[PDB]
Structure formats: C-alpha cells, structure tokens
Design a protein around this ligand. Structure first.
Ligand SMILES: *[C@@H]1O[C@H](CO)[C@@H](O[C@@H]2O[C@H](CO)[C@@H](O)[C@H](O)[C@H]2NC(C)=O)[C@H](O)[C@H]1NC(C)=O
Ligand SMILES: *[C@@H]1O[C@H](CO)[C@@H](O)[C@H](O)[C@H]1NC(C)=O
Lengths: 587, 578
C-alpha cells in the first residue's frame, strides 16, 4: 500500500487560538482514517477520498508532530511523513480604540475599549498630563472574539488640557509586573474658542487617485491642528506654516473611498481647545464607470434673464439621486431619481428659479446612492448655459450670401457698435456654444470671426449672437435672427416665370411666379449675392401645380433683378430644394 | 466684594440660611442677584457697613447661582464670585443627564450619568424599544454634593434603532419594584444615510429677542427630525408638513444667549438614521449695544472693476475681532482687532481682492469676543459699495444752470442712450449714494431727476452718475464729472471790463486788489477758468478768444476762488454785455 500524504491548512506555523485542519490526501478509498499526534491516537474519521481533521482554537498543548494513516477493511499499511505543527504566542501589547470617536464636548466622556491577549485580571488607562489620572478595570472575556478586553470611560474632559491616552494591563502579584503600552489615542475636544476655517484648494469634488490638500486657518495662538474624518479617521499636524498666520497642512497623495466623507478641523492652542470647524464635505468621483449619465437643457441653452429653465439629467442605471455641479463646485442640492416606465430611464428635473447672471457657466451632473453620499459616478458630458442680458443688441451678418450650396464654406461674423471683448455664437436647436475673442478693426468697432467648416445638411438653421465684456460676466441681448438655407437637398425642382417685358423701366412693375407640378409648401426668391433675407411666400395651387407670386412695386436700378426660386416643405422649414433655372431681368 | 454663606453652600432642606456680603468700602445699598432677588438700603445712617440676606426655610427653588452687589450712590462696580447654593432633597425620583452630548457615531458608546438623592444601591437604564436592553450599576456617593450617582455607558449604538433612555432606581433584595422614571434622554445617532439640508428662513444673523424658524428638509422616508445645538440643547419634532415633502418645523419666539451657537439636524426614518446636517451657525446681535462700531471705505465708495478696496471698521472698545456682513448674510471671515496706540481705537482693515460686481451691496461690521463667537455687537451704520462697470457712459446735465446761490434748489438730471432701469448719483468725497427709479422720456432714453435740498456751501462739489439694469447687478461706467460751484461765500467781489466798444462787430479782464488764486467766468454753460498774474499787487487775467460768433453774444460775469476751496466761489461781479 502506497504511503499517504498529509497536508495542513494554513501553514505549519500558526498563531494561537486559530482554527486548523489536517487534510489526508490518498488516491485509494479508505473506510477510515487515523491521525496520530506525537505517537498517540488523536482522532479517527470515517467516510466523508480525502478526510479532514478540524482542530478549532489550537492551544499550546496541541502543537507537536502529527501523522495520518488510512485503512481499508482488508488491510491498513501506510504511515505518512510527520508534519510539525508549531503554535506562536501572542504579543502583550494591548489595543486601544475610540469605540465611538475621539470627539468630545467639554465636560463629557468618551468610551475607550482596551483589548489584549492576557489572562491579566486588570487594565489601566493613563492620561499624559501634569497630574496623572488612572482608571482600573477588570478584564472581560469575549467568547466570540477569544480576546480579553475592558471598557474605559475617561472624563470629565476639560477644554484646557490636552488628552492623550495609553493603556496598560497587569495582574496584581505577578513578576512580569506591567504590560507594554498601547498606541496613543488622543481625544478631540470641542472647545469654546473661535473656530478655524477649513478649505480645500483644488475643490470639494476630486476625481479618484488624484492629489488634494486640506488647510484650516484659525487663531494665531494655535499649536496643533487635527483633521477628523467622519469615517473615523484622524490626521495630526504640528508644523504649520507661520506665514501668513497659522495654517495647518494636510496632504492626500491619492483619493480613494476611505478618504471621502465629511471633515472637521479641531484645534488646540495656548488658551485651550476651540470650537470645531465647519463640516467640509469631500466627494470622490470616478466610481460606477459603466453607466455615464447625460444632461440636457430645455428650452434652449441660452435663455433671457429672469426666466424659467429646467435641466434634465437622466441615466439608464437605477441611481438614487442626481446632483448638479457648476465648474468644479457643487451647485444646488440633490434630487431624487424618477423611473420613467416607458423610456427605461431614471429621471431628475432640476427646476431653476428666475435666472441670474451667476448661473452662467458649465454644468455637469453626477449620480450616486443614498448609502454612499460621497461616492459619485463618472461626470457627464458638459452642458454650457449662457444667460442673456439687457445690453445693446449686436449684429450678425454673413459674407458669401444666405442661401448656400454644400461645396462652399461659410464664415459667420458678428459685430457691435459697443466695444465687446468676447462674442458668442449659438445655433437655434443646438447645444454647443462657440466663444471667440474680438479684434479691433480700423473702423473702431469690434469684430469676431466665427469660422465654420464645409457646409452640410445639419448647418442649416437659425444663428444668434451675443456680446460680453472682460470684467463683466453678463452677456448681451440676442442678435436679430439669421436664417441659413441649404439648397440641393430636395429632389423637386421649380421653374420660374416673369410677367412682363425683360426691360422694365425705373417705375415699372413685375409679378414673378415659380410653379412646380410637385407639392411645395413655400417658395423662396433668391437674388445673386443675396446678403439680404430672401422673400418667402406660401403657395396657392389653382391647378395641380403649386405657385407663389412675388409682386414688385416701384422697382429701381439697384434691384438689378431676381434670379432663382427655391421650394420648401413644412417637414423641414429651412432645408431648401434645388435651384431653378436663372432668369435675368434688366431695368 | 466677597459673598459668604452660613452654613456651607450645600445645606439640608428646610433650614435657614444667611448671606454675608463683606465689603471694606461703605455702601448705601446692597443687591442680591439670583441667576434681582433682594435689596437692602443702608444710606450709611445704619451703624453696620455690612448687610444680611436671610432666607428662612430654604426649599429646592432657592438653589442656584447667587451674586451680591454693593453700591455707593455715585457709583456701583463690584460683582462677587458666585457661590453655588445646593439644596438636598429627600425624595426618590432620579435624574438622567447626557454627560457629554446625545450625539453618537454608529457602533459607539455615550456615557450617561444617573443621579438621585436616595440611598438606593442600584440604578437601571432602559431603552424604549421592542428588544429590552438593561444596564445595572451601583450607586457611588459624592461627599461634596451629598448625592448618589452612577455612570452608564450605553451601547453599542446601531444606526437602525431609535435609542430613548430612561433611568430607574430600586433596591437589591427586591426587584420589579422601581422608582418612577427620569425624563427620557434620546441619543442622536450619526447615521450613514443621506444628510438633510438645514435652512433658516429669516437668516443666520438675527437681532436679539426676535423670532426665527429653522427648517431642515431631508429624505422623504424620514419620521423624526432633531435640532441639536452644540451648546447641549435638543429640540424634537414629529409632526411635519407633508406638502411639499417632509419638512421639520422649529420655531423660536425670542432669540437669547442660550439659543446662539452651531446647530445640526439629525434625522431618523424607516431606513435608519442619517448623516447629520451641515453646521448652521446662529448669531444673536443686539448685545454690547454700548459701544457701536463705525465703518468707512477707502478710497471711494464707488471703485472701478478689478481694483483695490480696503474697508475700515474700528471701535473705541477692546473688541477681539470684527466681522463684515453684506445684506443679512455673513461676508468674508473674521479679522483680529489692532490697538492703535494714538487714536485709542481698535482697528481692523478688510482688504478685498480685485473687485467683482457681487461685492456691490450694503456692508455692516460687528464686534465680538473670542470666548463668545456667536454674540456680536450692535450693527454699525451701513456703508453702501457700488462697483462700476464697462457699460456705455451716461450723460449728466443740470437743469436750471450750473453755478447757483444759496436759497435755491438744484434738480440734477442724468440720462443715457441705453435703456437703464435704475440710476445712482454719487458726490465725490461723500459716503452716501442715492438710488432713483428711471423715467422713460419721449426722446427714447431713460432720465432720473435727482432733487437736492436747499443749496448750502457744503453741497458744492463734484457729482457723478451711474446706470444699471433690473435683472443686472453690474453698474455702468462713470459719467463725465460735474463740478457744482457755490456763490456768495467769499466776501471779496471782482470786477470785469471790456476795452473796444459797447457794440462789437476781444480779451476781457477780471481784476481784484486782494490775493486771488483763480478766477471763474460765467455765462448767463461750462464756466471758464482764468489764472491771475499779479502786477502792482493786483490780480488780473486776460481771456482771449481769437474769434467771435453771434451765439457768444451775452452777459459775462466773473467770480473769484482760492486754492483752499476749488468749488466755493466769491460773490457776483457787475455784468458786462457784449
Ligand atoms: C473676420 O473674417 C474676415 C473674412 O472672413 C477677415 O478678412 C476679410 O476678408 C474679406 C474677404 O474674405 C476681405 O475682403 C477683407 O479685406 C478682409 N479684411 C481684412 C482686414 O483683411 C477678417 O480679417 C476677420 N477678422 C479678424 C479679426 O481676423
Ligand atoms: C418691350 O420693351 C420695349 C422697350 O424697352 C417696348 O418698345 C416694347 O413695346 C415692349 N414689348 C412688350 C411686348 O412689352
């Protein structure tokens, strides 16, 4: 019979009072297995090819050499190579933990629990001060954690003394006398002096794994600043930058989940403790990366001053609440998410009161859950809001004509008699807003180049322009609407007709007509170099053909003539048909 | 003075006590202050110089803090060190007090002390819940206060259960026979759920003895909101307005010292406790009304956008710090007070970075001490700041003429081509700024009439004008300066002369024997300035024109002025008609 193999989990060197299991692996199938400890029968396991020997809570006596044997009814033969099980004792140093938090109001108590691995009857808590205060407690035994502990209630805490606690344990009459001390647990006292001002230089919202600093500047007689996280964390700083005034540095290399939450600066000085700082809430983003939210604005990203505006942030994921932020700073408050039964979206409408110039900026929305208020989602694609104002209306004129072809490039241009430092272009129905600086032309007024790429079907619409000053943050009023029309998209093609003679006199009249057998809702007259708004007429169909009369009264030589006519439908108000054969009239 | 008690400060019940107020000086009257309680008058006619305050048969109500004052008729000054008078009861009912504060972090302990005046050996602390938790402690005896007490450490506190503690006392040999309970002390748990938003409708800064409301709106699954003052106070509200959402009402009839400090809203609901609200700091003003501070601005109450500006608030009293407020809201932070050794003033300079339109408003400054950060002084006389902007320059014209004499009323008028909703007038060197509504004249531009009272010597100066829009908070640029000149202030009167002919188809001269620095020509129009060259001890000035037109025909007068006052003119000069 082949020799068996004995395994141990965990490793052969185990700490005291920890469960261990002996695994006896054998390829043959054995009716029973026998574990021999130091040459004596210790255990016997029957059935279940591998058998286990569980030794929960290993004591010092259980340490030694072990052997496993496997047996069949017909024969047993093999003894395994012995594996030495070694038990390691525990340290005598006790553990001192603020059972609630180091925060204490003046004249109050904070409960501290001191645990250790001693059979010692009594524990001691001492405070580092001119007078030495001691508390003596008996050791209680917790059967679940298998550890001896004792709770202390230090106090009453006076706001003039610095409280640093250390724990000791001993027995009354044993040679080893006292145990080594625990780690110093310092209490945070809510004094009566003036509160320090806590700030965050990068901001209160930081993406994960990035650096940030937390500084609180308080009284000039301070000595030590404490940065207490409400997630039960505490950082201590003594060396503070003296210039200018007392400023306590707290640096975090990379933000994680354990660094988010509310923070308060506690301050001890020459005149005692001080009132705690304001609750600065830190927020770590970059979690929940899969479902990025999306934000949009109604009715337009540019609204008049003092008007209704509703921002809409929704996500396919079941977020609990949505929070809006402007720039890197929090904005407004949190709103619950509403589950639309149809669109499968969790919605939240950020209704805003009468608009103010302060609302102008860059908005983002985040998603998070109630159980983790400081763990936000990935930021959403930014949505820029620009509230208009009551300044003088700039003018938006277009080189190269209104009605364009796909193969030409349009560069929009906005100017204003008032010296505006910056101009903004907006397309009605769009979301993005383009901002360009203004250059001082020789005529003395500002001019902004708004370059636009190759004209495509999307480019047609309505463009408005706004002005602003450098120091100012309030934008101007809207500029007169600008209709950009795109030709050559609709298959239908109209035909043009002229009523009278080609050579009309300086006072003659001409009613022209463009008609088409195919259905056309509106017709548009175009002039060569039509920098002017083309004339739009609805179409009245006497025959199966749609037609429209563009009457001309008291024509002049400047009006050389009218050349092409275009068709349009109600489905797309500003996407025009192809051109009609040109017709040149001469006055 | 020193206040003595016989017997000791801790007296048995129903026993007579006497207060001795010993003072080396002789005082006409004595006043005992409890927490004015009694007054004995001895106008030195009485032999003894010390007065007694007999409190026969002391009950529980007499316990508290006591102060004695001694006064001379001409002055009173001294308060004595308060001696805590403790009355000891014999009854069974115990008292339960949160030794620190009801605030608890989830999974922690809060120490509660239960004291009583009985010889009961054991105390019990019970929590009001479905599961019954009990703590049994032996009574420790304090020999100083002669009262039996026992400390309890309730916990661990779970953020899912509502913790309401009541204390009982009993005897060891018999159980189930408890004494009546103490007042229910409910712990405030710092949960992990979403934090409520705490607000104050009137504001965070309120004058004393006035009413205010504190509302915190949190989760819609809440049940009870707790408003905990960091001065160890707690208000509980259950009935909340359902529409719209859960809103907890907290009303205070009159604000006092005990209502100031930082407040936080703790919230318990169906899903457990929640993180406490933000630390809303309440401040009660109207205290220290004796020494009102004063605030001023340099260089001018109207500065250009993005410029240096320093606000100066000082007071004769030794305040620790000064705080600036805009409107009813706090602004900036606190600044230490600097004791100027010469002017006996405690100074604080509020330096402001590059100006922003948000700084436009109404500023006040308060004084307070470090030991009481929420007890501020009486508000100072307001100082209004109006930051200018980059809008189009308005125009400033004056009906009824520029140069006026006293006993006349001047109505200033400011217009601008841009539709401005509101106009503001400023006088260079002044502090106040006048704001008027705008009138839309038929010409298409806005116009504001700025009425000025009876013209006096002080009223002369330099007035500027600014424009604004309703929705906007950014003001316009400055309007061209307007110099107002006052006639009839200097006794000397100059004379004018014309050389050629009465009927011109010419350099004029205004002369004065007395020393005169500058001369001012006036048209019966922007006045003309002439410097004086002193030939033969007389001052004179020639005004050349190099050309003449029909419009220039008129009556021209000259006034005198000195460098000491640029806008205080002399009396009128005899007319000369061209
Ligand atoms: C704004 O755009 C125009 C063109 O889009 C710039 O230049 C003018 O271009 C037209 C024809 O394209 C010429 O007839 C003009 O003579 C050009 N003007 C000048 C001054 O060269 C114009 O310069 C742009 N503005 C700025 C500040 O770059
Ligand atoms: C066309 O115009 C010419 C002159 O321009 C005129 O003589 C002629 O009669 C006109 N004919 C018609 C048909 O209108």
């Amino acid at each position: 019979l082949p020799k068996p193999i004995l395994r141990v989990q965990p490793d052969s060197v185990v700490s005291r009072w920890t469960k261990v299991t002996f695994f006896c692996e054998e390829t043959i199938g054995a009716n029973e297995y026998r574990l021999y400890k130091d040459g004596k029968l210790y255990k016997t396991v029957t059935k279940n090819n591998k058998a286990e020997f569980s030794l929960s809570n290993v004591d010092l006596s259980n340490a030694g050499q072990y052997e496993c044997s496997y047996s069949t009814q017909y024969k047993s033969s093999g003894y395994s190579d012995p594996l030495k099980l070694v038990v390691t004792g525990h340290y005598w140093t006790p553990s001192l933990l603020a059972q609630a938090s180091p925060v204490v109001t003046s004249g109050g108590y904070v409960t501290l629990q001191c645990e250790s691995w001693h059979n010692d009857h009594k524990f001691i808590l001492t405070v580092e001060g001119p007078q030495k205060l001691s508390w003596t407690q008996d050791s209680q035994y917790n059967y679940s954690t298998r550890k001896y502990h004792a709770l202390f209630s230090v106090g009453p805490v006076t706001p003039n003394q610095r409280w640093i606690c250390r724990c000791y344990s001993y027995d009354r009459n044993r040679p080893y006398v006292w145990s080594p001390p625990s780690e110093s647990v310092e209490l945070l006292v809510s004094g009566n002096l003036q509160k320090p001002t806590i700030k965050a230089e990068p901001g209160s919202v930081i993406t994960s794994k990035r650096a940030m600093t937390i500084w609180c500047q308080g009284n000039l007689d301070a000595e030590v600043y404490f940065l207490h996280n409400e997630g039960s964390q505490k950082t201590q700083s003594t060396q503070t930058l003296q210039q200018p005034g007392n400023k306590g540095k707290f640096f975090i290399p990379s933000m994680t989940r354990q660094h988010a939450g509310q923070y308060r600066c506690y301050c001890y000085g020459s005149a005692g403790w001080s009132q705690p700082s304001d609750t600065l809430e830190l927020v770590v983003t970059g979690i929940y990366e899969h479902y990025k939210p999306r934000l949009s604005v109604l009715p337009s990203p540019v609204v008049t001053a003092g008007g209704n505006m509703t921002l809409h942030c929704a996500s396919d994921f079941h977020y609990d609440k949505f929070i809006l932020t402007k720039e890197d700073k929090k904005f407004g408050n949190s709103l619950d998410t509403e589950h639309i039964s149809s669109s499968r979206q969790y919605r939240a409408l950020f209704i805003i009161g009468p608009t103010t110039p302060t609302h102008t900026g860059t908005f983002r929305c985040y998603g998070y859950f109630k159980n983790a208020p400081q763990l936000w989602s990935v930021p959403s694609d930014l949505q820029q809001i620009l509230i208009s104002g009551l300044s003088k209306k700039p003018s938006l004129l277009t080189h190269q004509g209104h009605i364009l072809d796909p193969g030409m490039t349009l560069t929009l241009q906005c100017y204003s008699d008032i010296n505006y430092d910056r101009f903004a272009l907006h397309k009605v129905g769009g979301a993005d807003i383009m901002q360009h600086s203004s250059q001082q032309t020789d005529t003395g007024f500002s001019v902004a180049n708004f370059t636009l790429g190759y004209v495509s079907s999307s480019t047609g619409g309505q463009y408005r322009c706004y002005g602003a000053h450098n120091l100012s943050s309030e934008w101007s009023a809207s500029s007169e609407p600008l209709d950009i029309l795109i030709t050559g998209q609709l298959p239908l093609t109209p035909s043009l007709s002229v009523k009278p003679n080609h050579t009309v006199h300086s006072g003659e009249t001409v009613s022209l007509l463009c008609w088409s057998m195919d259905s056309v809702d509106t017709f548009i007259l175009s002039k060569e170099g039509s920098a002017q708004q083309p004339l739009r007429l609805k179409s009245k169909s006497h025959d199966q053909q749609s037609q429209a009369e563009f009457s001309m009264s008291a024509v002049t030589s400047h009006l050389s003539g009218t050349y092409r006519c275009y068709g349009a439908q109600n489905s797309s108000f500003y996407l025009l048909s192809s051109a009609s054969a040109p017709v040149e009239l001469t006055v």
